[PDB]
Design an enzyme around this catalytic site. Structure first.
Site, PDB file in Angstrom:
ATOM      1  N   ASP A 266      51.012  53.821  26.970  1.00 41.79           N
ATOM      2  CA  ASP A 266      51.642  52.599  26.484  1.00 41.79           C
ATOM      3  C   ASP A 266      51.950  51.568  27.574  1.00 41.79           C
ATOM      4  OD1 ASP A 266      52.642  50.792  24.614  1.00 41.79           O
ATOM      5  OD2 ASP A 266      54.591  51.786  24.431  1.00 41.79           O
TER       6      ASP A 266
ATOM      7  N   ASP B 258      55.076  62.293  18.431  1.00 42.17           N
ATOM      8  CA  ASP B 258      54.827  62.695  17.048  1.00 42.17           C
ATOM      9  C   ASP B 258      55.936  62.194  16.137  1.00 42.17           C
ATOM     10  OD1 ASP B 258      52.543  63.997  17.857  1.00 42.17           O
ATOM     11  OD2 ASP B 258      53.495  65.978  17.962  1.00 42.17           O
TER      12      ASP B 258
HETATM   13  N1  LIG Z   1      58.132  60.723  26.021  1.00 41.68           N
HETATM   14  C1  LIG Z   1      58.406  59.611  25.960  1.00 41.68           C
HETATM   15  C2  LIG Z   1      58.751  58.229  25.891  1.00 41.68           C
HETATM   16  C3  LIG Z   1      58.139  57.496  24.942  1.00 41.68           C
HETATM   17  N2  LIG Z   1      58.292  56.163  24.647  1.00 41.68           N
HETATM   18  S1  LIG Z   1      56.981  58.280  23.854  1.00 41.68           S
HETATM   19  C4  LIG Z   1      55.497  57.304  23.769  1.00 41.68           C
HETATM   20  C5  LIG Z   1      54.835  56.922  24.954  1.00 41.68           C
HETATM   21  C6  LIG Z   1      53.652  56.169  24.886  1.00 41.68           C
HETATM   22  C7  LIG Z   1      53.120  55.802  23.629  1.00 41.68           C
HETATM   23  C8  LIG Z   1      53.767  56.178  22.445  1.00 41.68           C
HETATM   24  C9  LIG Z   1      54.958  56.938  22.504  1.00 41.68           C
HETATM   25  N3  LIG Z   1      55.562  57.288  21.357  1.00 41.68           N
HETATM   26  C10 LIG Z   1      59.990  57.872  26.523  1.00 41.68           C
HETATM   27  C11 LIG Z   1      61.008  57.408  25.637  1.00 41.68           C
HETATM   28  N4  LIG Z   1      61.802  57.017  24.866  1.00 41.68           N
HETATM   29  C12 LIG Z   1      60.282  58.237  27.798  1.00 41.68           C
HETATM   30  N5  LIG Z   1      59.407  58.709  28.787  1.00 41.68           N
HETATM   31  S2  LIG Z   1      61.903  58.169  28.419  1.00 41.68           S
HETATM   32  C13 LIG Z   1      61.855  57.883  30.135  1.00 41.68           C
HETATM   33  C14 LIG Z   1      61.986  58.986  30.984  1.00 41.68           C
HETATM   34  C15 LIG Z   1      61.974  58.807  32.357  1.00 41.68           C
HETATM   35  C16 LIG Z   1      61.836  57.519  32.896  1.00 41.68           C
HETATM   36  C17 LIG Z   1      61.717  56.380  32.055  1.00 41.68           C
HETATM   37  C18 LIG Z   1      61.727  56.551  30.656  1.00 41.68           C
HETATM   38  N6  LIG Z   1      61.615  55.474  29.852  1.00 41.68           N
END
Ligand SMILES: N#CC(=C(/N)Sc1ccccc1N)/C(C#N)=C(\N)Sc1ccccc1N
Ligand SMILES: Nc1ncnc2c1ncn2[C@@H]1O[C@H](COP(=O)(O)OP(=O)(O)O)[C@@H](O)[C@H]1O
Ligand SMILES: [Ca+2]
Ligand SMILES: [Mg+2]
Ligand code: NA
Length: 314
Positions: free
Chosen positions: A152, A179
């Site tokens: 993303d 998911d």
């Molecule tokens: N896992 C996860 C994260 C997502 N947004 S999931 C995702 C990713 C790409 C495309 C689609 C989806 N659904 C997320 C959240 N909320 C995180 N990684 S949390 C995080 C953890 C460590 C450092 C920075 C952040 N934002």
């Protein structure tokens, strides 16, 4: 090229030291300072961990799922405890409470590039050179150390700080979260590669396309699809489409490109190689790292922190 310099190593050590002093993360231990922004996935707050006095970014994902699902999410996130890169946003921990998952991370006082762009109008090529380096190295690290892709990449997912750091956040680390989240929805597909929108190719190459697209948007000051007209161009440098229509355009029309004359040919070639529709012909991380634009940018002494603070008014 994932070698860390002195200043970078020092910052990582400091972060880890601070983190180690933090114990179990609990809802009542947090004091809200301000709302950093929201999304169709959850809201983000600048908070203060009362006990440690540490400032953090707390992301609240409201999900009335079973106490089981949330537990699997928290578990999958535990992997971030070993993810330490100057190009990836720091992770403190995660927990559930009052029907919602909480994700605590390093707070980036410069905000996201989408916010920075709004204030800048458009971001200078040399500044985008540092951003490109950071993004490539961030993707490289995730792939290498965690054997995963971002999934993303977009302006709102590239965070910066007064220290001049540029880091990636919101990468897909917990399959369950993706998911559980990808069950409902509401997270723009406007930066997704043609192959992903077609259900054909899905790899790190897809993240490179998203980066190229984000770079063009930041360079010209507007989401570049569809392409501007002579009118816009002359207006922008002197010199509507429904979501479903946009997605079809991306898949069926030629990729966007930077306007000529205003940007160096090296930068144009760089984004062009990122935006090749065929994921097989599109450059890969190793090729981008040695691209002439990257080599030139890496050797440039750019005061990103200075430009950033002056632009957003810090
Ligand atoms: N896992 C996860 C994260 C997502 N947004 S999931 C995702 C990713 C790409 C495309 C689609 C989806 N659904 C997320 C959240 N909320 C995180 N990684 S949390 C995080 C953890 C460590 C450092 C920075 C952040 N934002
Ligand atoms: N660690 C952080 N530090 C500072 N601001 C952040 C941090 N994480 C997220 N934000 C801000 O919160 C906003 C909402 O994040 P998010 O819920 O993922 O929606 P979005 O799709 O815009 O990323 C982001 O756009 C960003 O500006
Ligand atoms: Ca409480
Ligand atoms: Mg985000
Ligand atoms: Na609470």
């Amino acid at each position: 090229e994932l070698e860390l310099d002195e200043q970078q190593r020092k910052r990582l050590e400091a972060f880890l030291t601070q983190k180690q002093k933090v114990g179990e993360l609990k809802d009542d231990d947090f004091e809200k300072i301000s709302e950093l922004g929201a999304g169709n996935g959850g809201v983000v707050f600048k908070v203060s961990h009362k006990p440690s006095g540490l400032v953090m970014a707390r992301k609240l994902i409201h999900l009335e799922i079973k106490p089981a699902i949330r537990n699997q999410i928290i578990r999958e996130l535990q992997v971030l405890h070993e993810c330490n890169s100057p190009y990836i946003v720091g992770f403190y921990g995660a927990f559930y409470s009052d029907g919602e998952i909480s994700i605590c991370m390093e707070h980036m006082d410069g905000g996201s590039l989408d916010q920075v762009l709004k204030k800048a109008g458009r971001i200078p090529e040399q500044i985008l050179g540092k951003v490109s380096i950071a993004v490539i190295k961030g993707l490289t690290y995730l792939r290498e150390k965690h054997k995963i892709m971002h999934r993303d990449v977009k302006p709102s997912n590239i965070l910066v700080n007064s220290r001049g750091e540029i880091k990636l956040c919101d990468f897909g680390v917990s399959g369950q979260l993706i998911d559980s989240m990808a069950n409902s929805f509401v997270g723009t597909r406007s930066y997704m590669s043609p192959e992903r929108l077609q259900g054909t190719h899905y790899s790190v190459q897809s993240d490179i396309w998203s980066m190229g697209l984000s770079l063009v948007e930041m360079a010209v000051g507007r989401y570049p699809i569809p392409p501007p007209d002579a009118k816009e161009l002359e207006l922008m440098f002197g010199c509507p489409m429904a979501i479903f229509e946009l997605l079809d355009y991306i898949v069926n029309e030629p990729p966007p490109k930077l306007p000529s004359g205003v940007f160096s040919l090296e930068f144009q070639d760089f984004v062009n190689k990122c935006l090749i529709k065929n994921p097989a012909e599109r450059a890969d991380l190793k090729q981008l790292m040695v691209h002439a634009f990257i080599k030139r940018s890496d050797a440039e002494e750019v005061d990103f922190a200075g430009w950033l603070c002056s632009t957003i008014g810090l």
